[PDB]
Structure 1
Amino acid sequence: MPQLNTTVWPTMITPMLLTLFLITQLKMLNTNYHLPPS
């Protein structure tokens, strides 16, 4: 199982955090829902 090859493990951990915790959240924050007018 290549999933147990613990050598390339950082290569999977590092960008995910850069993608799950910074980039995707920065794209969500730009998804704004305004309040309906009168």
Structure 2
Amino acid sequence: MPQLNTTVWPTMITPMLLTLFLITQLKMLNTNYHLPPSPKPMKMKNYNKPW
């Protein structure tokens, strides 16, 4: 079983860490979801005429 060849293990451990923990994560941060725009048509800080 080549999986048990413990000599090239450091060749798999590092670039995974360089891919699972740095690169791919750095692409999810660049996938943002904005809150959808429903600005209410009812925003009027008004007041009765001067009386």
TM range (shorter): over 0.9
Partners in 1 of 2:32 and 2:5 — Cα distance? 42
The TM-score, its normalising length taken from structure 2, stands at 0.74
Q: Which blocks of at least 5 consecutive residues in structure 1 are unaligned? A: none
CA RMSD of aligned residues (A): 0.3
**Secondary structure of the corresponding residue to residue 20 of structure 1:** helix
- 1:10 deviates by 0.2
- Structure having the higher helix fraction is 1
Shift of 1:4: 0.2
Per-residue CA shift, 1:1-38, capped at 9, x if unaligned?
Answer: 00000000000000000000000000000000000001
Q: Which has the larger radius of gyration?
A: 2
Q: Give runs of ≥4 in structure 1 deviating > 4 Å.
A: none
For residues 33 and 5 of structure 1, the distance between their equivalents in structure 2, rounded to whole angstroms, comes to 44
